[PDB]
Amino acid sequence: IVFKVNNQVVSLKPEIIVDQHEYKYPAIKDLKKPCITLGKAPDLNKAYKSVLSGMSAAKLDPDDVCSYLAAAMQFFEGTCPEDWTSYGIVIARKGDKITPGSLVEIKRTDVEGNWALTGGMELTRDPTVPEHASLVGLLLSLYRLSKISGQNTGNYKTNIADRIEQIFETAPFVKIVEHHTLMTTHKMCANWSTIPNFRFLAGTYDMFFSRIEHLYSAIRVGTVVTAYEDCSGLVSFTGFIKQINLTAREAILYFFHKNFEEEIRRMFEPGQETAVPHSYFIHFRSLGLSGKSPYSSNAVGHVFNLIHFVGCYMGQVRSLNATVIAACAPHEMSVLGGYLGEEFFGKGTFERRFFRDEKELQEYEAAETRSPEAVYTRIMMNGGRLKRSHIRRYVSVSSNHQARPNSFAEFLNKTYSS
Amino acid sequence: IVFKVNNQVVSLKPEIIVDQHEYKYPAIKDLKKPCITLGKAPDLNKAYKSVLSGMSAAKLDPDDVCSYLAAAMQFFEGTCPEDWTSYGIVIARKGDKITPGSLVEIKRTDVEGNWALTGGMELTRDPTVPEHASLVGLLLSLYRLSKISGQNTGNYKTNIADRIEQIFETAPFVKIVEHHTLMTTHKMCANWSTIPNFRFLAGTYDMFFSRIEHLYSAIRVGTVVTAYEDCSGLVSFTGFIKQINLTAREAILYFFHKNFEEEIRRMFEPGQETAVPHSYFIHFRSLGLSGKSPYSSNAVGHVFNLIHFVGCYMGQVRSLNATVIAACAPHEMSVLGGYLGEEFFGKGTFERRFFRDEKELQEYEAAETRSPEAVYTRIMMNGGRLKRSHIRRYVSVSSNHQARPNSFAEFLNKTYSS
């Protein structure tokens, strides 16, 4: 490991660079439901009144909003269709009625909440359950709005806010926040995604409504972002598998580089309920046991870059607009992506599977090539160098598409200009 | 220094030239936290009103601002995720709530600050913590604006300032300076970066926010520049290793020149926590424990030139816009960079790594080449001279780029243009 130079005698200097990598995996070994600390429980009706005026008033109170959401969890409840097996916890069983309050553990402190209201609320009567659901959904949409941000997002950040208001102004929800109050409140509260309790609650809501069909399931429009949070690498891989029409296993066979080993191991920890249809895993980054996600595009950077380099070769716009992981050797990944993309672009593996009669099937059963080995030898024949055609294709895809600043398209344009 | 000149009779004269630097390193043997000397403790809210008025009035006193920032450090607290030790053991332990004041030692004298209310702006009540956070962030951001001075950077300074302002005008921060105040104070506070106490505090804030997540973590946007300050050489090297997909040791093997020796020793001196994730080293220049950085692009001039010259050949925009160190033999660096980039552009080292069966793995084990020796011989064969292809690539990259004043792109264009 030490590498040596001589000045007058031999020096043998060691090379030290920082490359720390610590990733926590999501699993419940203690059998404990995720826990957050909250304020004093308010009167449901009084809480609804305070938050409605505060929202109309463009006044943001973190403690009040989260406490209100926890109280509202009692309103939304449904019986569980089937027995629910998670990370050793089975809070839901078939024929058992469940609520958001039962799925997670919330710690309530008797410390009084401020429940202060700037004003703008004229309602003199106790709120109905739908009014409660309409307000609950709007806050969760504030969270999704915070995640948006970006640049050149004009007439897009406004659009998503408009969609949210439209859902909660129509049945089963009732319009309580006039128009454009949600957009302007977001301008006042654009960084609310940072708050942990707000994020945790959105994740709890999304998990319950995804599991149980509900009258107010449309509130999920705000909480949809919580699903597969900070897991784009795992999500990109699953999509890559489907777009390429391969099995996860065969797909990994094409990964002809040493760097993939660490990432493949990282994203496939033993167990982890990745395969489980409904599990804590989908919302692990929200809720608890998050840590830093080992599934993020950065954690699995080489696989991510290869997937989207392949995607650009195939003209997938999603890959064209994805932001490249600059650290994880994008140049080598683009070369492998060129060979993989050429193999998979415009080619399919077809076999007769439908026959008129059983005897015809038997005859077909008694009776250039797509394989990892074939691709590898092809790469070796060219000395591990891109073919000129790969370069042309890459250049043609990047030049016609509009390139975002840190996108794969921009990298392809800058890297190959001829 | 041997030399012979011939007049009517032969005469000998020696030559004389001068060059020498110190390059003191950051590690501290006394294990004493960095110390800054400031004035008498500020009057809480009174220091806040004076500096905020000064902001709207674009008149600020450096000593007072520093005392206010030191006092505001107590406001920001977070629990420490992991036990923390840098150089001599840091007091911070896992699960311990800490302040920025705990990271550096702050020394106060009997002399009191002017805390004058220069601006006509008035606040009826004592300020809330968010207001304090909003002011602390806006004050710190002047440091970043002070650093980004140069030719043609006007529209860009305003864009970063607008991003700064919108962060601190929206939650969890509150708008206290309206708009364009930040730019006008920067006009009068352009050289605030030179002020030692101001730099010391910014670095302390950045160290605290990097380790501990906080609601007001957005304050880091001003102090991000403090991290790895004046260590661009080392930063360029570590990226070069990752982009090129080399083990760092292997990368140094490719540096085929006598000049690299001094620089390689300079940047890899042991005993400096170049190997620790959250050490004082990352903010060493900002903090007191520093000298001229032996890690600066100038201190490691040849390595820096070689890295970005290879980067330019591979189309790395960062390298295209980096400013070349003219003293450190750029032409020779470009030639070597040309060969190295030729080796690394468009080529990858690919090997089958994933198999369905262990037997399959063993069979693949039973079964133009990238090596330092091959590259050195190739250079030797062409007599240490750039190939025509090297020149074409260099010109193609440089010409199809908006060459900056003293950038590598400019050096390439001026040097090889026919």
PDB file of N, CA and C in Angstrom, chain B residues 248-310:
ATOM      1  N   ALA B 248      -5.317   5.731  -5.951  1.00  0.00           N
ATOM      2  CA  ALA B 248      -4.486   6.791  -5.388  1.00  0.00           C
ATOM      3  C   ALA B 248      -3.005   6.449  -5.414  1.00  0.00           C
ATOM      4  N   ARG B 249      -2.640   5.292  -4.869  1.00  0.00           N
ATOM      5  CA  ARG B 249      -1.252   4.872  -4.957  1.00  0.00           C
ATOM      6  C   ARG B 249      -0.917   4.663  -6.413  1.00  0.00           C
ATOM      7  N   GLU B 250      -1.757   3.884  -7.100  1.00  0.00           N
ATOM      8  CA  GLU B 250      -1.553   3.658  -8.522  1.00  0.00           C
ATOM      9  C   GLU B 250      -1.493   4.977  -9.281  1.00  0.00           C
ATOM     10  N   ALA B 251      -2.328   5.949  -8.896  1.00  0.00           N
ATOM     11  CA  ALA B 251      -2.365   7.223  -9.603  1.00  0.00           C
ATOM     12  C   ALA B 251      -1.027   7.941  -9.516  1.00  0.00           C
ATOM     13  N   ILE B 252      -0.380   7.902  -8.353  1.00  0.00           N
ATOM     14  CA  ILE B 252       0.909   8.569  -8.218  1.00  0.00           C
ATOM     15  C   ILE B 252       1.960   7.921  -9.115  1.00  0.00           C
ATOM     16  N   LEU B 253       1.818   6.622  -9.411  1.00  0.00           N
ATOM     17  CA  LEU B 253       2.765   5.952 -10.307  1.00  0.00           C
ATOM     18  C   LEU B 253       2.812   6.590 -11.678  1.00  0.00           C
ATOM     19  N   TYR B 254       1.682   7.118 -12.126  1.00  0.00           N
ATOM     20  CA  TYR B 254       1.617   7.734 -13.433  1.00  0.00           C
ATOM     21  C   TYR B 254       2.272   9.112 -13.468  1.00  0.00           C
ATOM     22  N   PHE B 255       2.641   9.703 -12.322  1.00  0.00           N
ATOM     23  CA  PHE B 255       3.220  11.058 -12.299  1.00  0.00           C
ATOM     24  C   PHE B 255       4.699  10.969 -12.653  1.00  0.00           C
ATOM     25  N   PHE B 256       5.030  10.976 -13.949  1.00  0.00           N
ATOM     26  CA  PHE B 256       6.407  10.681 -14.364  1.00  0.00           C
ATOM     27  C   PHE B 256       7.240  11.954 -14.473  1.00  0.00           C
ATOM     28  N   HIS B 257       7.453  12.607 -13.342  1.00  0.00           N
ATOM     29  CA  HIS B 257       8.358  13.736 -13.433  1.00  0.00           C
ATOM     30  C   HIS B 257       8.999  14.038 -12.104  1.00  0.00           C
ATOM     31  N   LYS B 258      10.226  14.541 -12.178  1.00  0.00           N
ATOM     32  CA  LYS B 258      10.945  14.832 -10.951  1.00  0.00           C
ATOM     33  C   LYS B 258      10.212  15.876 -10.113  1.00  0.00           C
ATOM     34  N   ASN B 259       9.548  16.844 -10.757  1.00  0.00           N
ATOM     35  CA  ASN B 259       8.935  17.935  -9.999  1.00  0.00           C
ATOM     36  C   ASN B 259       7.845  17.455  -9.051  1.00  0.00           C
ATOM     37  N   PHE B 260       7.128  16.392  -9.410  1.00  0.00           N
ATOM     38  CA  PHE B 260       6.047  15.899  -8.567  1.00  0.00           C
ATOM     39  C   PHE B 260       6.538  15.451  -7.195  1.00  0.00           C
ATOM     40  N   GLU B 261       7.828  15.086  -7.069  1.00  0.00           N
ATOM     41  CA  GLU B 261       8.323  14.513  -5.815  1.00  0.00           C
ATOM     42  C   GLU B 261       8.089  15.452  -4.644  1.00  0.00           C
ATOM     43  N   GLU B 262       8.534  16.699  -4.763  1.00  0.00           N
ATOM     44  CA  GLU B 262       8.392  17.609  -3.636  1.00  0.00           C
ATOM     45  C   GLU B 262       6.930  17.784  -3.268  1.00  0.00           C
ATOM     46  N   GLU B 263       6.065  17.892  -4.273  1.00  0.00           N
ATOM     47  CA  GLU B 263       4.648  18.103  -4.013  1.00  0.00           C
ATOM     48  C   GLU B 263       4.016  16.885  -3.351  1.00  0.00           C
ATOM     49  N   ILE B 264       4.366  15.684  -3.819  1.00  0.00           N
ATOM     50  CA  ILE B 264       3.826  14.458  -3.235  1.00  0.00           C
ATOM     51  C   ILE B 264       4.182  14.357  -1.754  1.00  0.00           C
ATOM     52  N   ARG B 265       5.429  14.681  -1.390  1.00  0.00           N
ATOM     53  CA  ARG B 265       5.793  14.716   0.025  1.00  0.00           C
ATOM     54  C   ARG B 265       5.022  15.794   0.752  1.00  0.00           C
ATOM     55  N   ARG B 266       4.854  16.941   0.102  1.00  0.00           N
ATOM     56  CA  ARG B 266       4.211  18.061   0.758  1.00  0.00           C
ATOM     57  C   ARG B 266       2.779  17.725   1.130  1.00  0.00           C
ATOM     58  N   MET B 267       2.019  17.165   0.210  1.00  0.00           N
ATOM     59  CA  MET B 267       0.623  16.964   0.554  1.00  0.00           C
ATOM     60  C   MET B 267       0.367  15.706   1.374  1.00  0.00           C
ATOM     61  N   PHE B 268       1.321  14.789   1.461  1.00  0.00           N
ATOM     62  CA  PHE B 268       1.043  13.548   2.157  1.00  0.00           C
ATOM     63  C   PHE B 268       1.794  13.427   3.473  1.00  0.00           C
ATOM     64  N   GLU B 269       2.150  14.550   4.071  1.00  0.00           N
ATOM     65  CA  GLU B 269       2.860  14.511   5.334  1.00  0.00           C
ATOM     66  C   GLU B 269       1.994  13.837   6.390  1.00  0.00           C
ATOM     67  N   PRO B 270       2.545  12.911   7.159  1.00  0.00           N
ATOM     68  CA  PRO B 270       1.773  12.219   8.192  1.00  0.00           C
ATOM     69  C   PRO B 270       1.541  13.113   9.398  1.00  0.00           C
ATOM     70  N   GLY B 271       0.618  12.665  10.240  1.00  0.00           N
ATOM     71  CA  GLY B 271       0.285  13.341  11.477  1.00  0.00           C
ATOM     72  C   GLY B 271      -0.821  14.348  11.369  1.00  0.00           C
ATOM     73  N   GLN B 272      -1.196  14.728  10.160  1.00  0.00           N
ATOM     74  CA  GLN B 272      -2.326  15.600   9.882  1.00  0.00           C
ATOM     75  C   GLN B 272      -3.549  14.754   9.619  1.00  0.00           C
ATOM     76  N   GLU B 273      -4.672  15.135  10.220  1.00  0.00           N
ATOM     77  CA  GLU B 273      -5.861  14.288  10.143  1.00  0.00           C
ATOM     78  C   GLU B 273      -6.552  14.329   8.778  1.00  0.00           C
ATOM     79  N   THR B 274      -5.753  14.142   7.735  1.00  0.00           N
ATOM     80  CA  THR B 274      -6.300  13.994   6.393  1.00  0.00           C
ATOM     81  C   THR B 274      -7.120  12.745   6.251  1.00  0.00           C
ATOM     82  N   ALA B 275      -7.137  11.943   7.303  1.00  0.00           N
ATOM     83  CA  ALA B 275      -7.780  10.650   7.290  1.00  0.00           C
ATOM     84  C   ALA B 275      -8.992  10.570   8.219  1.00  0.00           C
ATOM     85  N   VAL B 276      -9.430  11.670   8.830  1.00  0.00           N
ATOM     86  CA  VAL B 276     -10.482  11.658   9.846  1.00  0.00           C
ATOM     87  C   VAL B 276     -11.701  12.360   9.259  1.00  0.00           C
ATOM     88  N   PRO B 277     -12.938  11.838   9.448  1.00  0.00           N
ATOM     89  CA  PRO B 277     -14.093  12.423   8.755  1.00  0.00           C
ATOM     90  C   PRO B 277     -14.445  13.816   9.243  1.00  0.00           C
ATOM     91  N   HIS B 278     -14.532  14.029  10.553  1.00  0.00           N
ATOM     92  CA  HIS B 278     -14.960  15.366  10.951  1.00  0.00           C
ATOM     93  C   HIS B 278     -13.924  16.031  11.826  1.00  0.00           C
ATOM     94  N   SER B 279     -12.725  16.217  11.308  1.00  0.00           N
ATOM     95  CA  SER B 279     -11.665  16.706  12.165  1.00  0.00           C
ATOM     96  C   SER B 279     -11.489  18.190  11.955  1.00  0.00           C
ATOM     97  N   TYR B 280     -10.649  18.758  12.798  1.00  0.00           N
ATOM     98  CA  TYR B 280     -10.302  20.136  12.611  1.00  0.00           C
ATOM     99  C   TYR B 280      -9.664  20.391  11.253  1.00  0.00           C
ATOM    100  N   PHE B 281      -9.125  19.365  10.608  1.00  0.00           N
ATOM    101  CA  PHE B 281      -8.424  19.608   9.359  1.00  0.00           C
ATOM    102  C   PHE B 281      -9.333  20.254   8.314  1.00  0.00           C
ATOM    103  N   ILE B 282     -10.600  19.826   8.232  1.00  0.00           N
ATOM    104  CA  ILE B 282     -11.475  20.295   7.146  1.00  0.00           C
ATOM    105  C   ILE B 282     -11.641  21.810   7.174  1.00  0.00           C
ATOM    106  N   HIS B 283     -11.564  22.402   8.366  1.00  0.00           N
ATOM    107  CA  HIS B 283     -11.678  23.830   8.611  1.00  0.00           C
ATOM    108  C   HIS B 283     -10.388  24.400   9.168  1.00  0.00           C
ATOM    109  N   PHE B 284      -9.264  23.743   8.890  1.00  0.00           N
ATOM    110  CA  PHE B 284      -8.024  24.161   9.524  1.00  0.00           C
ATOM    111  C   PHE B 284      -7.631  25.578   9.113  1.00  0.00           C
ATOM    112  N   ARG B 285      -7.765  25.922   7.829  1.00  0.00           N
ATOM    113  CA  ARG B 285      -7.369  27.265   7.404  1.00  0.00           C
ATOM    114  C   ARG B 285      -8.274  28.329   8.024  1.00  0.00           C
ATOM    115  N   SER B 286      -9.587  28.067   8.069  1.00  0.00           N
ATOM    116  CA  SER B 286     -10.508  29.029   8.670  1.00  0.00           C
ATOM    117  C   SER B 286     -10.189  29.220  10.156  1.00  0.00           C
ATOM    118  N   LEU B 287      -9.945  28.127  10.884  1.00  0.00           N
ATOM    119  CA  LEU B 287      -9.578  28.202  12.293  1.00  0.00           C
ATOM    120  C   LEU B 287      -8.145  28.696  12.449  1.00  0.00           C
ATOM    121  N   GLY B 288      -7.764  28.977  13.697  1.00  0.00           N
ATOM    122  CA  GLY B 288      -6.460  29.569  13.935  1.00  0.00           C
ATOM    123  C   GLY B 288      -5.274  28.683  13.596  1.00  0.00           C
ATOM    124  N   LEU B 289      -5.428  27.370  13.743  1.00  0.00           N
ATOM    125  CA  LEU B 289      -4.355  26.384  13.614  1.00  0.00           C
ATOM    126  C   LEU B 289      -4.010  26.159  12.149  1.00  0.00           C
ATOM    127  N   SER B 290      -3.212  27.072  11.602  1.00  0.00           N
ATOM    128  CA  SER B 290      -2.919  27.033  10.176  1.00  0.00           C
ATOM    129  C   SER B 290      -1.724  27.923   9.861  1.00  0.00           C
ATOM    130  N   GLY B 291      -1.312  27.857   8.606  1.00  0.00           N
ATOM    131  CA  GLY B 291      -0.212  28.615   8.072  1.00  0.00           C
ATOM    132  C   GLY B 291      -0.587  28.727   6.617  1.00  0.00           C
ATOM    133  N   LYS B 292       0.343  29.070   5.725  1.00  0.00           N
ATOM    134  CA  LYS B 292      -0.002  29.002   4.316  1.00  0.00           C
ATOM    135  C   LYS B 292      -0.226  27.528   4.045  1.00  0.00           C
ATOM    136  N   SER B 293      -1.249  27.212   3.286  1.00  0.00           N
ATOM    137  CA  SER B 293      -1.636  25.819   3.195  1.00  0.00           C
ATOM    138  C   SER B 293      -0.675  25.087   2.274  1.00  0.00           C
ATOM    139  N   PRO B 294      -0.089  23.980   2.728  1.00  0.00           N
ATOM    140  CA  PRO B 294       0.697  23.125   1.844  1.00  0.00           C
ATOM    141  C   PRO B 294      -0.177  22.311   0.907  1.00  0.00           C
ATOM    142  N   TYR B 295      -1.495  22.439   1.011  1.00  0.00           N
ATOM    143  CA  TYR B 295      -2.442  21.720   0.182  1.00  0.00           C
ATOM    144  C   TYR B 295      -3.081  22.586  -0.886  1.00  0.00           C
ATOM    145  N   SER B 296      -2.696  23.851  -0.967  1.00  0.00           N
ATOM    146  CA  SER B 296      -3.288  24.774  -1.921  1.00  0.00           C
ATOM    147  C   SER B 296      -2.869  24.413  -3.332  1.00  0.00           C
ATOM    148  N   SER B 297      -3.652  24.875  -4.312  1.00  0.00           N
ATOM    149  CA  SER B 297      -3.325  24.551  -5.696  1.00  0.00           C
ATOM    150  C   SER B 297      -1.928  25.033  -6.053  1.00  0.00           C
ATOM    151  N   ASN B 298      -1.470  26.141  -5.469  1.00  0.00           N
ATOM    152  CA  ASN B 298      -0.103  26.592  -5.733  1.00  0.00           C
ATOM    153  C   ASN B 298       0.934  25.711  -5.043  1.00  0.00           C
ATOM    154  N   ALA B 299       0.684  25.297  -3.800  1.00  0.00           N
ATOM    155  CA  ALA B 299       1.678  24.501  -3.082  1.00  0.00           C
ATOM    156  C   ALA B 299       1.943  23.177  -3.788  1.00  0.00           C
ATOM    157  N   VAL B 300       0.958  22.664  -4.492  1.00  0.00           N
ATOM    158  CA  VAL B 300       1.057  21.401  -5.190  1.00  0.00           C
ATOM    159  C   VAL B 300       0.818  21.695  -6.675  1.00  0.00           C
ATOM    160  N   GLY B 301       1.517  22.717  -7.178  1.00  0.00           N
ATOM    161  CA  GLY B 301       1.195  23.270  -8.491  1.00  0.00           C
ATOM    162  C   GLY B 301       1.266  22.282  -9.642  1.00  0.00           C
ATOM    163  N   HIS B 302       2.331  21.494  -9.698  1.00  0.00           N
ATOM    164  CA  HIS B 302       2.463  20.542 -10.792  1.00  0.00           C
ATOM    165  C   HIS B 302       1.372  19.476 -10.740  1.00  0.00           C
ATOM    166  N   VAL B 303       1.069  18.952  -9.545  1.00  0.00           N
ATOM    167  CA  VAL B 303       0.054  17.903  -9.461  1.00  0.00           C
ATOM    168  C   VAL B 303      -1.292  18.462  -9.857  1.00  0.00           C
ATOM    169  N   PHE B 304      -1.583  19.677  -9.397  1.00  0.00           N
ATOM    170  CA  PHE B 304      -2.833  20.326  -9.749  1.00  0.00           C
ATOM    171  C   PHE B 304      -2.930  20.517 -11.257  1.00  0.00           C
ATOM    172  N   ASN B 305      -1.860  21.006 -11.882  1.00  0.00           N
ATOM    173  CA  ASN B 305      -1.924  21.196 -13.321  1.00  0.00           C
ATOM    174  C   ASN B 305      -2.173  19.894 -14.034  1.00  0.00           C
ATOM    175  N   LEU B 306      -1.430  18.853 -13.659  1.00  0.00           N
ATOM    176  CA  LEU B 306      -1.590  17.568 -14.317  1.00  0.00           C
ATOM    177  C   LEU B 306      -3.016  17.057 -14.184  1.00  0.00           C
ATOM    178  N   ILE B 307      -3.603  17.202 -12.998  1.00  0.00           N
ATOM    179  CA  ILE B 307      -4.935  16.661 -12.744  1.00  0.00           C
ATOM    180  C   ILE B 307      -5.969  17.308 -13.649  1.00  0.00           C
ATOM    181  N   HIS B 308      -5.961  18.637 -13.713  1.00  0.00           N
ATOM    182  CA  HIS B 308      -6.983  19.312 -14.500  1.00  0.00           C
ATOM    183  C   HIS B 308      -6.670  19.225 -15.981  1.00  0.00           C
ATOM    184  N   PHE B 309      -5.385  19.163 -16.362  1.00  0.00           N
ATOM    185  CA  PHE B 309      -5.099  18.918 -17.778  1.00  0.00           C
ATOM    186  C   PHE B 309      -5.686  17.575 -18.212  1.00  0.00           C
ATOM    187  N   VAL B 310      -5.555  16.537 -17.379  1.00  0.00           N
ATOM    188  CA  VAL B 310      -6.232  15.280 -17.684  1.00  0.00           C
ATOM    189  C   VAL B 310      -7.732  15.488 -17.668  1.00  0.00           C
TER     190      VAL B 310
END
